[PDB]
Design an enzyme around this catalytic site. Structure first.
Site, mmCIF file in Angstrom:
data_model
loop_
_atom_site.group_PDB
_atom_site.id
_atom_site.type_symbol
_atom_site.label_atom_id
_atom_site.label_comp_id
_atom_site.label_asym_id
_atom_site.label_seq_id
_atom_site.Cartn_x
_atom_site.Cartn_y
_atom_site.Cartn_z
ATOM 1 N N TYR A 1 -7.602 8.158 1.798
ATOM 2 C CA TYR A 1 -7.267 9.162 0.691
ATOM 3 C C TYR A 1 -8.868 9.506 0.044
ATOM 4 C CZ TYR A 1 -2.936 11.836 0.897
ATOM 5 O OH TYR A 1 -1.600 12.576 1.000
ATOM 6 N N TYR B 1 0.719 -1.214 0.050
ATOM 7 C CA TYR B 1 0.482 0.051 -0.369
ATOM 8 C C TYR B 1 0.886 1.702 0.089
ATOM 9 C CZ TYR B 1 -4.164 -2.552 0.515
ATOM 10 O OH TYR B 1 -5.509 -4.010 0.142
ATOM 11 N N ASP C 1 -3.123 12.122 6.937
ATOM 12 C CA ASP C 1 -1.681 12.552 6.698
ATOM 13 C C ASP C 1 -1.162 12.250 7.747
ATOM 14 O OD1 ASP C 1 -1.807 12.358 3.573
ATOM 15 O OD2 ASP C 1 -0.614 14.822 3.134
ATOM 16 N N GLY D 1 -0.518 1.625 -5.501
ATOM 17 C CA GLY D 1 -1.519 0.737 -5.379
ATOM 18 C C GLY D 1 -2.718 0.908 -4.191
ATOM 19 N N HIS E 1 -4.694 4.552 5.189
ATOM 20 C CA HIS E 1 -3.695 6.061 4.357
ATOM 21 C C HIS E 1 -4.680 6.096 3.006
ATOM 22 C CE1 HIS E 1 -1.175 9.247 2.631
ATOM 23 N NE2 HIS E 1 -1.438 9.633 4.145
ATOM 24 N N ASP E 2 -4.245 5.309 2.480
ATOM 25 C CA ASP E 2 -4.974 4.726 0.803
ATOM 26 C C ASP E 2 -6.270 5.367 0.951
ATOM 27 O OD1 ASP E 2 -2.279 5.367 -0.051
ATOM 28 O OD2 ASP E 2 -2.620 2.627 -0.977
ATOM 29 N N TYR F 1 -2.578 21.941 2.859
ATOM 30 C CA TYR F 1 -4.133 21.863 3.743
ATOM 31 C C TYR F 1 -2.875 23.117 4.483
ATOM 32 C CZ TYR F 1 -1.574 18.429 3.927
ATOM 33 O OH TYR F 1 -0.176 16.559 4.588
ATOM 34 N N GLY G 1 2.384 4.247 -1.444
ATOM 35 C CA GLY G 1 2.983 4.592 -2.205
ATOM 36 C C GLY G 1 1.605 3.960 -3.580
HETATM 37 O O1 NFL Z 1 2.251 6.443 0.384
HETATM 38 C C1 NFL Z 1 2.857 6.429 1.074
HETATM 39 O O2 NFL Z 1 3.284 6.278 2.089
HETATM 40 C C2 NFL Z 1 4.835 7.888 0.645
HETATM 41 C C3 NFL Z 1 5.494 7.530 1.705
HETATM 42 C C4 NFL Z 1 6.433 8.732 1.619
HETATM 43 C C5 NFL Z 1 6.356 9.217 -0.042
HETATM 44 N N1 NFL Z 1 5.794 9.092 -0.940
HETATM 45 C C6 NFL Z 1 4.259 8.375 -0.304
HETATM 46 N N2 NFL Z 1 3.150 7.896 -1.721
HETATM 47 C C7 NFL Z 1 3.626 8.232 -2.984
HETATM 48 C C8 NFL Z 1 2.564 7.588 -3.441
HETATM 49 C C9 NFL Z 1 2.179 8.517 -4.893
HETATM 50 C C10 NFL Z 1 3.299 9.107 -5.420
HETATM 51 C C11 NFL Z 1 4.242 9.821 -5.232
HETATM 52 C C12 NFL Z 1 5.189 10.039 -5.972
HETATM 53 F F1 NFL Z 1 4.689 11.329 -6.572
HETATM 54 F F2 NFL Z 1 6.487 10.640 -5.050
HETATM 55 F F3 NFL Z 1 5.660 9.497 -7.248
HETATM 56 C C13 NFL Z 1 4.620 8.934 -3.854
HETATM 57 CA CA CA Z 2 -0.789 3.649 -3.044
#
Ligand code: NFL
Ligand code: CA
Length: 119
Positions: free
Chosen positions: A51, A27, A93, A31, A47-48, A67, A29
């Site tokens: 969102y 999860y 967040d 996905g 977290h996903d 924000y 990033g």
């Molecule tokens: O999802 C997290 O926990 C996360 C944590 C730190 C940095 N980036 C994160 N996610 C994240 C998700 C999509 C795109 C990007 C990007 F744009 F940097 F590629 C970052």
């Molecule tokens: Ca994700």
């Protein structure tokens, strides 16, 4: 927004570079499918979803919404001057950042094959 989220992490988990959280488990990033490999992955799963929920509010884009918040002396605070959308994402967040600090990090779970391991 992502920058702000990136910054909530650096302040909540200083000992670790934020990119360690960019691509981890199923999860953190991209996905949003499969079984969370571990507590840290669970933090990202929640977290996903958060969102996703926030997305239901019109014009509300969790990755891009800017924000109001602050992080000093170990405290993360979403300020009173956030509209519904900002308030929600910020909380998404903030909660994740706190969860991250409390979750164990398993190097083996960094950069796993999503296509094969998160179905
Ligand atoms: O999802 C997290 O926990 C996360 C944590 C730190 C940095 N980036 C994160 N996610 C994240 C998700 C999509 C795109 C990007 C990007 F744009 F940097 F590629 C970052
Ligand atoms: Ca994700």
């Amino acid at each position: 927004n992502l920058y702000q989220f990136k910054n909530m992490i650096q302040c909540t988990v200083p000992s670790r570079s934020w990119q360690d959280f960019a691509d981890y488990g199923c999860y953190c990033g991209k996905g949003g499918s499969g079984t969370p490999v571990d507590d840290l992955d669970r933090c990202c799963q929640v977290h996903d979803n958060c969102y996703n929920e926030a997305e239901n509010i019109s014009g509300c884009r969790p990755y891009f919404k800017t924000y109001s918040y602050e992080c000093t002396q170990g405290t993360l605070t979403c300020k009173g001057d956030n509209n519904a959308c900002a308030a929600s994402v910020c909380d998404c967040d903030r909660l994740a950042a706190i969860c991250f600090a409390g979750a164990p990090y398993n190097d083996a779970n960094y950069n796993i094959d999503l296509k094969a391991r998160c179905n």
